Design a protein around this ligand. Structure first.
Ligand SMILES: Nc1ncnc2c1ncn2[C@@H]1O[C@H](COP(=O)(O)OP(=O)(O)OP(=O)(O)O)[C@@H](O)[C@H]1O
Ligand SMILES: Nc1ncnc2c1ncn2[C@@H]1O[C@H](COP(=O)(O)OP(=O)(O)OP(=O)(O)O)[C@@H](O)[C@H]1O
Ligand SMILES: [Mg+2]
Ligand SMILES: [Mg+2]
Ligand SMILES: [Mg+2]
Ligand SMILES: [Mg+2]
Ligand SMILES: [Mg+2]
Ligand SMILES: [Mg+2]
Ligand SMILES: [Mg+2]
Ligand SMILES: [Mg+2]
Ligand SMILES: [Mg+2]
Ligand SMILES: [Mg+2]
Ligand SMILES: [Mg+2]
Ligand SMILES: [Mg+2]
Ligand SMILES: [Mg+2]
Ligand SMILES: [Mg+2]
Ligand SMILES: [Mg+2]
Ligand SMILES: [Mg+2]
Ligand SMILES: [Mg+2]
Ligand SMILES: [Mg+2]
Ligand SMILES: [Mg+2]
Ligand SMILES: [Mg+2]
Ligand SMILES: [Mg+2]
Ligand SMILES: [Mg+2]
Ligand SMILES: [Mg+2]
Ligand SMILES: [Mg+2]
Ligand SMILES: [Mg+2]
Ligand SMILES: [Mg+2]
Ligand SMILES: [Mg+2]
Ligand SMILES: [Mg+2]
Ligand SMILES: [Mg+2]
Ligand SMILES: [Mg+2]
Ligand SMILES: [Mg+2]
Ligand SMILES: [Mg+2]
Ligand SMILES: [Mg+2]
Ligand SMILES: [Mg+2]
Ligand SMILES: [Mg+2]
Ligand SMILES: [Mg+2]
Ligand SMILES: [Mg+2]
Ligand SMILES: [Mg+2]
Ligand SMILES: [Mg+2]
Ligand SMILES: [Mg+2]
Ligand SMILES: [Mg+2]
Ligand SMILES: [Mg+2]
Ligand SMILES: [Mg+2]
Ligand SMILES: [Mg+2]
Ligand SMILES: [Mg+2]
Ligand SMILES: [Mg+2]
Ligand SMILES: [Mg+2]
Ligand SMILES: [Mg+2]
Ligand SMILES: [Mg+2]
Ligand SMILES: [Mg+2]
Ligand SMILES: [Mg+2]
Ligand SMILES: [Mg+2]
Ligand code: NA
Ligand code: NA
Lengths: 527, 50
RNA sequence: CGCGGGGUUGAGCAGCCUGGUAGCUCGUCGGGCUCAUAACCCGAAGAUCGUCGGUUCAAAUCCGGCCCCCGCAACCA
RNA sequence: UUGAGCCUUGAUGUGUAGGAUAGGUGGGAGGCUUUGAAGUGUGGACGCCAGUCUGCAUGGAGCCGACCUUGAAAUACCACCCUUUAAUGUUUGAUGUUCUAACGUUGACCCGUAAUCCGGGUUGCGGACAGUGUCUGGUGGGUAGUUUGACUGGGGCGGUCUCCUCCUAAAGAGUAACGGAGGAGCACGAAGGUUGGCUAAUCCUGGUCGGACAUCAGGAGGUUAGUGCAAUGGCAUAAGCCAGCUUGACUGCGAGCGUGACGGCGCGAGCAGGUGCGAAAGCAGGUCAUAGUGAUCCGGUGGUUCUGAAUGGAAGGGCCAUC
RNA sequence: GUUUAUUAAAAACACAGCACUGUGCAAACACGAAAGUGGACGUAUACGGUGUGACGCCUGCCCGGUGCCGGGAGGUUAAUUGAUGGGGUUAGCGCAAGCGAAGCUCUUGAUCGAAGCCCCGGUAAACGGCGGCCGUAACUAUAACGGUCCUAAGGUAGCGA
RNA sequence: AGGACCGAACCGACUAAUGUUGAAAAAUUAGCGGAUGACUUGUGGCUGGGGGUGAAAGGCCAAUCAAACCGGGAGAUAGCUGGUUCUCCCCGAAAGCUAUUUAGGUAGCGCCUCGUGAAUUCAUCUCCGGGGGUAGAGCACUGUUUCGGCAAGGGGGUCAUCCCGACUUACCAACCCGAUGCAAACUGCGAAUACCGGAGAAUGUUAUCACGGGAGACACACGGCGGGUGCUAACGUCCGUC
RNA sequence: UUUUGUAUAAUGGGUCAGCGACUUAUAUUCUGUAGCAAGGUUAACCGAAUAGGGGAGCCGAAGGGAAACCGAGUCUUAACU
RNA sequence: CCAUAGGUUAAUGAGGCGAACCGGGGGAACUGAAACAUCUAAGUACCCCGAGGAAAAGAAAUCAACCGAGAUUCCCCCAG
RNA sequence: AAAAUGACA
């Protein structure tokens, strides 16, 4: 029955959203959208109350429950699946860890005497004695099979990893700050599943995804944060699209009315100024110009990064040579033989529902995971560029934005010709003097597009490129690969990116891996 | 201009602050100087605030 | 030498919009179609962004001076 | 017709693992059943579809419970409530049709009356609409009160209005003009403090790319360089150039002066308390100095019993810091 | 025909004629703090406001701006309603700081909330508007013609020192 | 028949003269337009002051109209003009600075006057201790400038005009050397006066300072000297000093 | 009269006679003089009423501080040479 | 229909004038702020209604302050 | 669907 309040935040130069003043409450789900690298994730991170803003407008509601799914979908490879879901209850988790230091403590103290009783009575009061079982039924209820309940999250497919992480959020909370960009789970089947779960649950939830269609079926209000602040536009998404791109147009027309009215008062002032009979009237509109004050126009953060990949040697005959792969981790092998040939092109969109091993195919196609195969036989002068599905080991050791980008080069100069490439994809002068690990989402992805700019990889992979991009970098990336000369073997989950971009399909289903149907406008047409 | 006003609130618990200016665009991190607190009559640390 | 606006490829124009790619329509040229010329199809050429400086890693773009063009003003008893 | 709240009753609510679609608290293991049963057929409704379920006589009198995998026991039992839900009433909102009884009638007829006013009566038509009162949003030169700067080689236009540097300024200070020339509305957590150390521009010769001009080695020169920012004065004991440690860019005061009609502005040895650098003598109360800035009222934030309109509090003031 | 009695008698005002627009009658509109009157003892072939001004040939393009008319989907929005959160006081709990029921209070303000405006169309005998640069025809000149930029549209018929 | 035609009564007012302390606070004379119509006229009514009426001029509303007349608020306010009345004695200015919705007003100080209280307090001259950067001068610096010598270097042409540049020029020409000038914003030099401080005699009805009562004034003018501006023009204009 | 300045050809006045412009009330400050003097003095009012009662009250003898408060001291400051 | 409205008659009272004072219903602006709009001038000028020799007010749901005073009205202080 | 033109002798 309560609502949230206002905040204001800044991570350095040019503060971000500058005195937001909004309220979220009721049952309506405020779909929060915005360009890459602008508020959004960190705006509602403040809303969760774990970190406080700079200007400190404060937004308090400390009585009810908040459950938050975040963007770091791989932030726990260690905790078992049952532990991650239980940890969604913050009070239960922190109590248990200090309680669990019983069998790990060989000697007990006097003050520990009632302390262990004090923690145990709190455990029973919030009934932690059923948390493992309470989560298990819910965990089974979202589609995770029993046999992987006790397994580690390292050995769970990222598409499945969202189903666990949504179960963590759903812990009887009447609001959820969903950072859910349904990146990995875009099977349409799983997407359609997540649309039913959220729609038929009554909560004052917030959704942040970039999927235009997904926001239609679920969200009722939109909270675009584009120029310097967030404005709430009711309507789904395409009733929004008119107003947001019309209120801008009506401002440019109003702004250009004054700029054309001033320029016509300057006709009188510049003509009848020295005149003795008309001077008192020209100085009546010479001081009327000084009272118009046309309102300033700010630039939208929804810019279009300009990326293009160019070759270095351009092999001519063919790239791939796979005889028989027969790779399986701990169950029935995900593929049997997979005889493959690329023939210098054939952008080879790998497909399939999540959890069938398309990412483990690419990982062993590049030679990281050793298969029981007989080698993959790269070409004579292949320069492989890799964009892994998960990319977090690269962004470590606290290098800066300029530092991280700099080492990747072969002949270009260190000061210029890498600032331009790094700055071409929307990195301002003050944005490159901060650690490269503090970047967020699309900027992490945009770095790996820039990484292949200077590298000039003759052969490309791009495991899952269109994950966190902001619907404009996707249009740029789709255009960048379209005129690309060379070979790339990508696996994408959405339809339009695969359909428009050149393709030679290789779908993976147990057990036969269907190879080739042409345009992917015919692959579905054959069905 | 681009230089705005801050206050260094003491750490000795008492309410005392030296007010200065600091450029935020170049450096967005806090300021830590050991200054004099006349309320307790000692040199203590003054973390930036406001 | 008082005040505004402008100088970009052969012509007419964007791009200056908060600095990271020299672009549109005609035009010239070389092929093709045709008996031949137009129309049309394919391919390429040219610009020191008026000049000279100044912060910039980086300037058509930001600042300063000069040149050239187009307007307007230089009042009433 | 449809939303919202309230009461009453009845229904209502698993996978993991089983004899089973068990909500929570644990009081208890004996209730239940014939104020007609076990099973039988017969129908709703609900139903992560097996079942709960209750109108139904007949059949007529045994079923349940403990145990059993379980994180937990069991419609075996009752109570105190929870979830979702239907029915009554229950108070209210929204809309739609109707109704007369407020109200309107500048429709008709009768009377006061020898009266196209007014009042009363009968009736017809509208009918909770219209209209009026208080409050309120929009529009409102229809109307009213007023404003619309100064210097100025007459007035207007142009220029200017506060601060800093040089000349005019007549070798102390000051000194005007719409006199001649340029700048400011900042910057710096180091570009401040201290200790240690260092000395430039420009030329010649010789030297791979290398070039009138990069970096290097010698010699002449002497500060013609440098100073975050315009100009003047200054600077080798460097105030210019490097590095180590640091916060004195600190709190309360301040003899004595300088400059202003005042408001004010500036310099300052030294005293008290606590720091920094150095072995120590000592230096340090911002920066080589001069521009980088606006009084009072009104209000905002923090601290502090100073006051607190009978008393105890408090609101509100005061003082200190600050916007 | 009328007009500045007392320096202007006119090209000014009026006019018959034309058009737009309002008004269904207790008409619009006007004088009235109101009752009431005029409009009119008239009823859309009537009445009021605005502009043009006999008669003849005619009255071109522009709805972007400002007005007026229509639309109701959506955004913003007053009074009214007072859900929540914070403070003041204190019965009590402690014979420490401190905490704080009920009530009374100060304040914040969830929900309901029309016209208007934003938005979508129309209207110019509604107020108003109606373009540049470059090249080109057998001597010269000029462009019937072409390119391009912009605009809501670029001044047509007629007339022209 | 006609808002028809010519034309007296009647209604008007187009031209000229006179008149202008008039016969008249708009008329007389000679001509002039309408004169059966939207005409003219007698008597009586109605509309009133931000209102009336207006064939529309801001016209008329009692010789008064961009808001009538009378009385009242009322002795509105006037930083603006004018005026300010008997006598003698003593002293005796300013027309400047600063600020100003300020510039012809005012406020504080400077200048005047009256009273009180104080120091060889103050003024002139001689001697002593001082800091200048003006006049003048000078060209080491900042600029500028003319000669003469050397000459970097930038050009001009001659070659296979491919390289090395191999030969040339009637060229210009920076830095230094010698000579010659100029400067408010130049100074390796630098007065006279003025100013500040100290000591000393004489002279001066305290002439000096502080406080307190009362002001006026803040429009200046010409002349000499040093200047800015102007034309080294103005009884021009802005400063310093007399 | 107004001015830097007037015979000024800048204002005013034809002459005479009469009238015509710094006042009154209540407060505050300074000077002179008179009374009393660490004290001075009443107002309204009563009053056979310019006497006499009336000391309500005002000024002064003590200041400092925003204030509580302290007091020939007091404020600032943790404290002042 | 009763009755009311209306009509006539009789008795009583009022009407209008007046200088100031008094209570009530309305209520400006010039002016000052060195302009002006909050404010001031001012509840003043003026208009209207009513009454008396006087008129209004008047007998605490008032003050004070842990001591007390005792309706209303007028004058001097408190006090600029 | 688009399809213009061709000096005398
Ligand atoms: N710790 C930080 N401190 C200061 N500024 C930060 C910090 N972290 C991020 N930023 C800045 O804030 C920006 C916004 O980051 P944020 O996490 O909000 O991403 P986002 O806009 O939600 O992006 P995406 O849509 O890709 O998830 C970053 O690009 C960076 O410039
Ligand atoms: N290290 C591992 N140990 C055990 N099982 C693994 C391991 N890695 C992958 N798997 C399993 O094998 C399959 C391979 O999945 P993988 O992680 O390669 O991604 P994917 O199937 O392509 O999924 P998505 O489309 O969601 O990215 C999955 O079923 C996953 O659970
Ligand atoms: Mg007006
Ligand atoms: Mg007035
Ligand atoms: Mg003036
Ligand atoms: Mg001097
Ligand atoms: Mg001098
Ligand atoms: Mg002077
Ligand atoms: Mg420095
Ligand atoms: Mg040193
Ligand atoms: Mg230093
Ligand atoms: Mg300096
Ligand atoms: Mg009290
Ligand atoms: Mg306070
Ligand atoms: Mg006529
Ligand atoms: Mg006339
Ligand atoms: Mg006339
Ligand atoms: Mg009528
Ligand atoms: Mg006309
Ligand atoms: Mg027209
Ligand atoms: Mg006639
Ligand atoms: Mg007439
Ligand atoms: Mg006549
Ligand atoms: Mg006629
Ligand atoms: Mg006639
Ligand atoms: Mg008459
Ligand atoms: Mg008259
Ligand atoms: Mg008037
Ligand atoms: Mg008056
Ligand atoms: Mg008068
Ligand atoms: Mg006046
Ligand atoms: Mg004398
Ligand atoms: Mg004046
Ligand atoms: Mg000289
Ligand atoms: Mg003056
Ligand atoms: Mg003067
Ligand atoms: Mg003078
Ligand atoms: Mg003169
Ligand atoms: Mg004089
Ligand atoms: Mg004169
Ligand atoms: Mg004379
Ligand atoms: Mg003369
Ligand atoms: Mg004479
Ligand atoms: Mg005279
Ligand atoms: Mg005169
Ligand atoms: Mg005279
Ligand atoms: Mg007299
Ligand atoms: Mg005292
Ligand atoms: Mg009477
Ligand atoms: Mg005034
Ligand atoms: Mg005045
Ligand atoms: Mg009485
Ligand atoms: Mg008592
Ligand atoms: Mg042709
Ligand atoms: Na994010
Ligand atoms: Na994968």
């Amino acid at each position: 029955m309560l609502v949230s309040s206002n905040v204001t935040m800044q991570f350095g130069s040019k503060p971000l959203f500058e005195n937001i003043s909004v309220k979220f409450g009721g049952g309506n789900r405020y779909g929060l959208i915005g360009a890459n690298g602008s508020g959004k994730s960190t705006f509602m991170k403040i809303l969760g109350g774990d970190l406080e803003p700079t200007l400190g407008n404060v937004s308090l509601d400390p009585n009810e429950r908040i459950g938050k799914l975040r963007q770091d979908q791989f932030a726990f490879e260690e905790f078992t699946v049952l532990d991650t879901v239980i940890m969604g209850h913050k009070e239960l988790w922190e109590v248990k860890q200090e309680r669990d230091r019983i069998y790990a403590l060989p000697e007990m103290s006097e003050e520990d005497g009632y302390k262990v009783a004090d923690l145990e009575v709190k455990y029973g009061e919030m009934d932690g004695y059923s948390a493992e079982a309470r989560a298990g039924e819910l965990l089974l209820g979202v589609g995770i099979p029993v046999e992987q309940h006790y397994g580690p999250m390292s050995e769970v497919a990222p598409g499945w990893k969202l189903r666990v992480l949504l179960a963590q959020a759903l812990f009887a909370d009447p609001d959820i700050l969903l950072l859910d960009q349904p990146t990995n789970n875009l099977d349409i089947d799983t997407i359609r599943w997540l649309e039913q779960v959220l729609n038929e649950r009554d909560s004052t939830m917030i959704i942040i995804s970039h999927d235009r269609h997904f926001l239609n079926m679920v969200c009722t209000h939109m909270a675009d944060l584009d120029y310097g602040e967030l404005r709430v536009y009711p309507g789904n998404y395409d009733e929004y699209m008119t107003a947001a791109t019309q209120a801008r147009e009506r401002l440019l027309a109003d702004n250009a009315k004054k700029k054309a009215q001033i320029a016509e008062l300057q006709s009188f002032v510049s003509r009848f100024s020295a005149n003795a009979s008309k001077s008192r009237q020209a100085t009546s509109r010479a001081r009327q110009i000084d009272k118009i004050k046309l309102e300033e126009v700010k630039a939208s953060s929804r810019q279009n990064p300009f990326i293009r990949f160019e070759q270095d040697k351009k092999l001519f005959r063919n790239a791939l040579e796979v005889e028989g792969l027969t790779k399986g981790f701990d169950n029935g092998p995900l593929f049997k033989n997979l005889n493959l040939l690329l023939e210098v092109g054939e952008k080879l969109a790998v497909l399939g529902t999540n959890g069938v091993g398309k990412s483990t195919l690419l990982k062993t196609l590049v030679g990281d995971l050793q298969p029981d195969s007989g080698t993959v036989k790269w070409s004579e002068n292949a320069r492989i560029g890799y964009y892994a599905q998960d990319h977090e080991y690269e962004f470590e050791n606290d290098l800066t934005v300029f530092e991280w980008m700099s080492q990747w080069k072969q002949e270009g100069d260190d000061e210029q010709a890498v600032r331009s490439i790094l700055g071409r994809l929307l990195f301002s002068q003050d944005d490159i003097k901060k650690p490269a690990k503090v970047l967020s989402g699309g900027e992490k992805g945009r770095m790996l597009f820039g990484k292949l700019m200077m590298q000039k990889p003759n052969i490309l992979i791009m495991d899952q490129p269109t994950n966190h991009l902001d619907m404009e970098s996707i249009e740029s990336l789709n255009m960048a690969l379209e005129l690309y000369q060379g070979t790339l073997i990508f696996v994408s989950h959405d339809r339009e990116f695969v359909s428009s971009l050149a393709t030679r399909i290789l779908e993976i289903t147990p057990e036969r891996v269907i190879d080739f149907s042409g345009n992917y406008e015919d692959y579905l047409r054959s069905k | 201009g681009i230089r705005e006003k801050i206050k260094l609130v003491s750490s000795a618990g008492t309410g005392h602050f030296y007010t200065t200016t600091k450029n935020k665009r170049t450096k967005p991190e806090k300021l830590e100087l050991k200054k004099f607190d006349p309320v307790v009559r000692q040199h203590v640390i003054y973390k930036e605030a406001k």
